[PDB]
């Protein structure tokens, strides 16, 4: 019994793992020359692990925690105590919106939990930003929320469905747990454990047909792969440019076209000494260096690791920037915090920007009017099942990518 | 003499006020802020050069604008558009276009858009221009080039914008090739100077509008009640949603106002001892913090050189929280990527004011996926309340459109 898995990111890898354990022959088809998709770890010469893709899970992410245990891996706690530079340096723990502004937000979150699907479709016509401004939240408070949500969405609240953001705020992601050896230890552990899996590299899927009890997937090279079932883990843009016979369901196609992938750019600097003056260092800014942090994984490392996460148009600013420019953006952020000292940079690692046709720059974001898109993207098409972070309950997370694989494999 | 209330003193409100005043109607002009002109503002530099911190250019064929400028005894100047691009490498003006295949696809789509019914336009409007053109076979590289080509108008990513709206805009896309002698604020000041029988109320935002018994009653934050036979709103979309209306706005108009996203356009001028460019008619695009940089000088035989910078999107917030030293460095790094890394001899700097965006938008109304019909809804009168401003116009998001919107509203009084 052969099952085709399309895409070798963590959802594809976890699907392949679960299938292979039940004695199914898996045909895993990957567009690029590497497995792991939006997960990528660089081992620095210091022994520190640099997560250029997904770096954190939440302590309560059950799928991830269960798989990490199953595979004999280990997690480390990552303390989140973030300063903010906005107008002035604001110490960690001191810059949230006012308790009364939070009460308005809690009321709207509970309202979205209580209303029916028709009411939710109506609320989804409006951006979270415009909806909160209409409900009397200040521009100042909305800017604070934009920092607080930035490491998840990677884009402005002006871009996002009010309904989706209020839905997400029931159980908002926290980035407080790392995998020992970096997040690519998890992807590699899955790869090391596949049995009876043929992997095709550097050969994107261009067409999918189903009929006569078979799924046939054709790649760019002209290779035809047949199976009893297929699990798509492909990003939304690829669902629309692959040729399907028969055609994707009308709502699934529209839903793939509504998805807007956010733009999350990561830079690590390897430094001679600590540029921060406190433990558990992290800080937000509106500058090109949006979020900087002590990223070190090797607790007794001489070299120090400064991580930078920049979202939105900052991705394109950084993709255009030289290494000296990235160092300066980071030094200016440290200077506004009262540091400024010329950083002693030994090495640099940044995001790869050349294969975004296959590997999204960020996570699926849900603009106004996209209500229902996850349900439509998840819906099976006979023996073609759909997974990926954009199909999950906890969408846009490693947890969600993994949970999506279980949901698809359980249908066969 | 009927009284007409004009809400907002940007160029649409000032032109409405001028038009009404010309026929002898008593106008009550209500402005939220301490200045008239709204998204138009000109700083006069000590060099004699005019710095347009707001709207800078009209198109040669913007007839509403050209006709009014002539009528107020003002003059225009030509602005040559020859824009370089830094994107991977320095690409000289005229050498950077989308692929011929992609240009053919875009030509056919812009043609298709004027030959499909309203059901088809509503369906196309569900998708972003970016995702639609990618689906239709345009490359990421082609879409990044269009993003530069359209940036001085929209001031935001094509990933934000209705496919339908952008295809509809491409039949007559705005070109920025004409400036006003003395800066754009010469026009707003000439309107202010030509008002007769106009009471101007400053620093007193409208908070409620009622209509009944053949009158419109407008109330301000201070509690002033102004009565009129008719009322022209030039207010931006967010203000329509927060003002209390009795009777209430039509559901489609309220939704339309809540769908509008205002782009974020930040402007800086450097006054320099020496030209940092090496050609005449200099301008250049990049993805850097300094998105569009240009020779902005207006004064002939100026010793002092004026470098203008327009930056959009998240660049607005980056710049709003930047020091003057950082702004200079963002501009020097943009010049360095074109081959001019020489230190700048900076005499003075002027930037965007960021503090009144509640009342004065940071950019132009943009129309995301799902916003099909918003302009028609925002324009629609409510008895003797008429709607104007750039977001109600055929050439929405321009000075021309703001001016045209005033004529359409005043004609109905
Ligand atoms: C920079 C960044 C930081 C992140 N940080 C975090 C974080 O800290 N924590 C968190 O929980 N989440 C984070 N996320 C989200 C998380 O990375 C993703 O949700 C998750 O890794 C996606 O897994 P996936 O299997 O759904 O997709 P992907 O990892 O994108 O895998 C899809 C695969 O399909 C392949 N493919 C595409 N098209 C084709 C085709 N035509 N044929 C064949 N193969 C194809 C691609 O090459 C890729 O390998 C981050 C995302 C990014 C980009
Ligand atoms: C930075 C920037 C650059 C631009 N560049 C160009 C360009 O080069 N060429 C071009 O053609 N267009 C350009 N535009 C667009 C152009 O500026 C606008 O289309 C036009 O000026 C808008 O005029 P308006 O009268 O519709 O609105 P505004 O100028 O915004 O006027 C609205 C007025 O209403 C007032 N107001 C708001 N709320 C209330 C209230 N509650 N009560 C009373 N008054 C209130 C405001 O304070 C303001 O004075 C640019 C815009 C910006 C922001």
**Any idea where the domains of chain B sit in the sequence?**
3-38+182-261+363-410, 97-172, 264-351
Q: How far apart are CA B219 and CA B206, in angstroms?
A: 6
* Nearest residue of A to residue B131, measured between CA atoms: A257
Chain centre to alpha carbon of residue B34: 20
Mutate to test the interface with B, among A284, A286, A313, A357 (most CBs of B within 10 A): A313
Distance (Å) of CA B380 to CA A27, B10, B212, B232: 58, 20, 18, 12
Q: Which ligand has the minimum distance to the alpha carbon of residue B364? A: 2
- In B314-333, the residues whose Cβ lies within 8 Å of chain A are 314-315, 317-318, 320-322, 326, 329, 333
Q: How much distance in Å is there from the Cα of B386 to the middle of ligand 2? A: 18
8 Å CB contact of A237 and B134: yes
How many CB atoms sit inside 10 A of residue B114's CB? 10
Looking at the domain covering A263-350, what would its CATH class be? alpha beta
- The neighbouring-strand residues paired with B285 are B85, B292
Q: Is the separation of the CB atoms in B305 and B297 below 8 Å?
A: yes
Q: How far apart are CA A351 and CA B257, in angstroms?
A: 38
User: Helix, strand or coil for residue A120?
Assistant: helix
Q: Specify the residue with its C-alpha closest to ligand 1, atom 32.
A: A9
By the 10 Å C-beta count (0-12 exposed, 13-18 middle, 19+ buried), B259 is classed as buried
**HSE toward the beta carbon, residue B137, CA cutoff 13 A:** 11
Residues 6+ apart with CB under 8 A from B89: none
Q: How far apart are CA B260 and CA B240, in angstroms?
A: 11
Cα dihedral: B37, B43, B49, B53 (round 10): -70
Q: How far apart are CA B99 and CA A33, in angstroms?
A: 27
* Chain B residues close to A376, C-beta within 8 Å: none
Cα dihedral: B407, B156, B357, B210 (round 10): 50
Q: How far is B2 from chain A (nearest CA, A)?
A: 34
Distance (Å) of CA A87 to CA A292, A308, A331, A341, B46: 17, 20, 17, 21, 30
8 Å CB contact of B289 and A288: yes
User: Helix, strand or coil for residue A68?
Assistant: helix
- When the candidates are 2.60.450.10, 3.40.50.300, 3.90.660.10, 1.10.10.10, the CATH number that belongs to B264-351 is 3.90.660.10
- The neighbouring-strand residues paired with A2 are A25
Q: Which ligand 1 atom sits nearest the alpha carbon of residue A399?
A: 11
Q: Name residues contacting ligand 2 (CB within 6 A).
A: B 7-13, 30-33, 38-40, 54-58, 176, 205-206, 234-236, 239, 265, 267, 359-361, 363-364, 389-390, 397-400, 402
Distance (Å) of CA A213 to CA A23, A216, A381, B369: 20, 10, 13, 39
Looking at the domain covering B3-38+182-261+363-410, what would its CATH class be? alpha beta
By the 10 Å C-beta count (0-12 exposed, 13-18 middle, 19+ buried), B122 is classed as middle
Q: Which strands, in side-by-side order, build the sheet including B265-272?
A: B89-91, B84-87, B283-286, B292-295, B305-312, B265-272, B346-351
- The neighbouring-strand residues paired with A177 are A57, A77
Which superfamily, per CATH, for A2-37+183-260+367-409? Answer: FAD/NAD(P)-binding domain (3.50.50.60)
Q: How much distance in Å is there from the Cα of A38 to the middle of ligand 1? A: 3
Question: Peptide bond preceding A355: is omega within 30 degrees of 0, i.e. cis?
Answer: no
Phi, psi of B153 (to 5 degrees): -85, -70
Q: Is the dihedral of CA A282, A287, A290, A295 positive or negative?
A: negative
Beta strands at B206-212 and B42-44: parallel, antiparallel or unpaired: unpaired
Q: Using the 8-state DSSP alphabet, how is residue A98 labeled?
A: P
CATH 2.40.50 describes domain B97-172:
no
Cα dihedral: B103, B108, B109, B112 (round 10): 170
Q: How much distance in Å is there from the Cα of B72 to the middle of ligand 2? A: 20
Q: Where are the alpha helices (DSSP H) in A311-352?
A: 313-320, 323-336
- The preferred substitution site among A5, A9, A149 for testing ligand 1, maximizing ligand atoms within 8 Å of CB, is A9
* Packed helices B11-22 and B399-410: angle between N→C axes, nearest 10 degrees: 40
Secondary structure element (H or E) that encloses residue A207, with its range: strand A205-211
How many CB atoms sit inside 10 A of residue A210's CB? 19
8 Å CB contact of A156 and B314: yes
Specified resolution (Å)? 1.8
Q: Which ligand 2 atom sits nearest the alpha carbon of residue B398?
A: 11
- The preferred substitution site among A30, A36, A37 for testing ligand 1, maximizing ligand atoms within 8 Å of CB, is A37
* Chain B residues close to A126, C-beta within 8 Å: 255, 258-259
Secondary structure element (H or E) that encloses residue A19, with its range: helix A10-21
- The preferred substitution site among B9, B10, B29 for testing ligand 2, maximizing ligand atoms within 8 Å of CB, is B10
Q: What burial letters (b/e) apply to A84-113, b meaning 16+ CB within 10 Å?
A: bbbeeebebeebebeeebeebbeebbeebe
Q: How far apart are CA A60 and CA A173, in angstroms?
A: 10
């Amino acid at each position: 019994k052969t099952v085709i898995v399309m895409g070798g990111g963590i959802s594809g890898l976890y699907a392949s793992y679960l299938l292979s354990k039940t004695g199914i022959k898996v045909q895993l088809i990957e567009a690029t020359d590497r497995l792991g998709g939006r997960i990528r770890t660089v081992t620095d010469v210091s022994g520190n692990f640099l997560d250029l893709g997904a770096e954190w899970i939440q302590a309560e992410h059950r799928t991830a925690k269960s798989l990490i245990r199953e595979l004999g891996l280990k997690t480390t706690d990552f303390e989140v105590q973030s300063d903010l530079f906005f107008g002035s340096y604001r110490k960690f723990g001191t810059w949230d919106i006012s308790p009364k502004s939070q009460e308005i937000l809690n009321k709207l979150v509970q309202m979205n939990s209580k209303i029916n699907s028709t009411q939710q479709q109506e609320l989804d016509r409006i951006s979270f930003y415009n909806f909160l401004n209409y409900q009397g939240m200040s521009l100042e408070d909305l800017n604070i929320l934009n920092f607080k949500y930035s490491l998840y969405y990677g884009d402005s609240l002006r871009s996002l469905s009010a309904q989706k953001v209020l839905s997400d705020l029931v159980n908002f992601p926290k980035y407080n747990t790392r995998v020992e050896g970096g997040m690519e230890t998890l992807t590699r552990a899955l790869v090391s454990s596949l049995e009876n899996t043929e992997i095709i590299f550097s050969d994107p899927v261009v067409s999918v047909s189903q009929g006569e009890g078979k799924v046939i997937v054709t790649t760019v090279s002209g290779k035809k792969i047949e199976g009893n079932a297929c699990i798509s883990t492909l990003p939304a843009n690829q669902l629309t440019t692959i040729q399907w016979d028969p055609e994707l369901d009308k709502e699934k196609k529209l839903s793939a076209l509504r998805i807007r992938y956010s733009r999350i750019y990561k830079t690590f600097l390897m430094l001679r000494e600590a540029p921060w003056t406190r433990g558990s260092f992290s800080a937000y800014s509106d500058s090109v260096a949006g979020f900087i942090y002590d990223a070190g994984t090797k607790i007794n490392s001489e070299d120090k690791i400064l991580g930078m996460i920049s979202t939105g148009d900052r991705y394109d600013i950084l993709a255009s920037s030289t290494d000296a420019m990235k160092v300066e953006y980071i030094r200016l952020a440290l200077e506004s915090l009262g540091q400024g000292r010329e950083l002693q940079v030994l090495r640099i690692q940044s995001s790869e920007t050349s294969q975004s046709k296959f590997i999204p720059t960020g996570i699926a974001t849900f603009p106004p009017g996209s209500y229902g898109s996850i349900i439509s993207l998840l819906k099976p098409m006979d023996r073609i099942f759909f997974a990926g972070e954009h199909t999950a309950e906890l969408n846009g997370t490693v947890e969600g990518a993994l949970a999506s694989a279980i949901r698809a494999v359980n249908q066969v």
